[PDB]
């Protein structure tokens, strides 16, 4: 039930990054998936390592 604007603000609060685009889809099993592109000043690989991926 979340929308794009709420997702973008939640990401910054949780991980302290700035984004440039959010794309969403609803999966066939009912879940919602989001692709989030970070700004060039932020490294997605560095953030994923901090997350624990």
């Amino acid at each position: 039930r979340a929308n794009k604007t709420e997702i973008k603000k939640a990401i910054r609060k949780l991980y302290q990054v700035k984004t440039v685009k959010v794309n969403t889809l609803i999966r066939p099993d009912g879940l919602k998936k989001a692709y989030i592109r970070l700004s060039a000043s932020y490294d997605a690989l560095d953030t994923a390592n901090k997350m624990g991926l």
Binding site: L14, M51, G52, L53
Partner: protein
């Protein structure tokens, strides 16, 4: 882990802080769940979830206690939220009160006083 006896004394600000730390710790556990975890790390998810529910229980009760005290006066008696009023069945809330059901007229009062019940026995 938390104990309900310790959460009782803490203030609202302290309880709200402890809620945020528990929610953050739960989020990290879900991330590891997507990867391979191990049995020990898979446990304590229920422990964190239980602790969150205990903090919310204390927070809600304190709020409801404050509202009851605020409206604890005969002045308002109608601004009180319906959820705070005593809930019985729908029929019991409309039936008749104790004082309304036993009302007697002036003639009824005098007759009852003049001819009271007696206990007599025979022989």
């Amino acid at each position: 882990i938390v104990k309900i006896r310790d959460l009782k004394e803490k203030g609202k600000d302290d309880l709200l802080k402890q809620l945020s730390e528990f929610k953050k710790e739960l989020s990290q556990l879900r991330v590891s769940q997507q990867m391979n975890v191990g049995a020990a790390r898979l446990g304590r998810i229920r422990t964190i979830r239980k602790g969150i529910a205990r903090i919310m229980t204390v927070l809600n009760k304190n709020e409801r206690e404050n509202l009851r005290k605020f409206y604890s006066d005969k002045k308002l008696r109608s601004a009180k939220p319906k959820t705070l009023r005593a809930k019985l069945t729908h029929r019991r809330r409309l039936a008749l009160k104790a004082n309304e059901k036993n009302r007697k007229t002036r003639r009824q009062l005098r007759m009852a006083h003049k001819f009271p019940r007696r206990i007599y026995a025979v022989k």
